[PDB]
């Protein structure tokens with residue numbers, strides 16, 4: 001089973017990955033985790049990270065350019081993902097393909113049913129071969145709470161809010177597959193039971 | 197012996213590659229050729245090509261984004277190149293790193309002294325460890341004639357770089373500066389009527 005944990009910056013994804021992993025383990029299942037972007041493991045990820053901090057000229061000014069970089073980072077992880085899927089009962093990803101759909105659409109002021117979100121699906125799942133997640137878990141957070149709890153994306157308050165809005169719609173519309181929306185207080189045991 | 201052939205679109209680089217290949221094989225040296233972008237062998241290359249034709253939204257609007265894709269395409273070729281440099285006396289590349297420096301600078305209205313060319317240097321050679329070419333051969337041709345070739349060899353489609361006559365002229369000018377200053381190593385500037393056999397003896 002492949003599970004992707006999604007959310008805006010400051011959502012608390014790392015902590016949820018930890019709790020959920022612990023719940024599946026207590027339930028008698030092996031669990032492996034992987035986080036994106038894979039900083040320090042792929043040039044694409046590192047260049048994207050640098051671009052978000054002002055490096056590489058006009059690269060970050062392009063929505064599709066940035067999305068392509070994150071997608072190429074994931075492309076180089078296909079072999080790893082397939083390996084984990086063959087060796088573990090549950091593979092939990094901290095950010096996956098939906099991240100690209102949400103942030104790209106938000107930057108273009110588009111919605112979940114927009115062009116960028118559709119493009120992400122056509123490119124990553126079909127052309128790059130990224131496995132579709134069985135479940136995409138959105139750790140939803142309001143803009144106010146997020147704004148409460150420094151690259152180009154992090155500093156852009158408007159972008160974060162719009163990205164949260166796109167995510168909420170990607171989840172409701174079942175983009176890429178089935179979604180579940182949870183809070184940072186979700187009970188690990190019940191969530192794991194629901195995602196079993 | 198790593199040899200890279202450079203030049204604007206429609207310069208006739210393919211034709212020169214062949215001639216140089218045969219000439220080298222005559223002198224008793226084995227040769228392998230590889231062209232960039234590696235269409236069909238790299239997703240980075242295929243997306244770059246489609247982007248040059250208007251696909252993928254605003255991708256092509258970013259000069260550095262396009263340079264990066266071509267740079268990533270080559271990075272995924274580092275092992276294939278090293279390999280060739282192992283199984284053949286001479287390796288001839290149709291376009292290489294200098295192509296990125298020339299077009300990027302040209303798109304930004306910069307020259308060999310601009311940030312873009314220096315950027316391509318750091319990223320491709322200093323960071324991605326792409327093998328420095330022994331020789332970079334600039335096939336200098338008439339801008340009018342090169343543009344006509346592209347138009348003809350397609351109208352019988354042209355991408356965004358090919359249809360930009362001013363871009364092609366500037367790219368030709370940047371190339372001359374790169375060759376003149378020995379950017380990335382030693383260069384050799386030749387014409388369309390260059391004698392194959394003589395060129396080979398010169399290079400090797």
Ligand SMILES: Cc1cn([C@H]2C[C@H](O)[C@@H](COP(=O)(O)O)O2)c(=O)[nH]c1=O
Pocket residue numbers: 009036037067070071095096097099100101103104153154
């Ligand atoms: C993995 C991924 C991240 N991003 C973003 C969201 C973050 O602001 C930034 C780096 O992610 P991070 O904060 O989880 O390390 O890049 C995308 O836009 N698309 C993607 O596919």
Ligand SMILES: Cc1cn([C@H]2C[C@H](O)[C@@H](COP(=O)(O)O)O2)c(=O)[nH]c1=O
Pocket residue numbers: 205232233248262263266267291292293295296299300357358
């Ligand atoms: C290989 C390469 C090509 N280009 C260009 C020049 C061409 O107009 C276009 C596609 O190359 P092509 O005419 O050899 O098929 O992309 C770059 O800008 N950087 C590169 O590194």
Ligand SMILES: [Mg+2]
Pocket residue numbers: 204205206
């Ligand atoms: Mg061409």
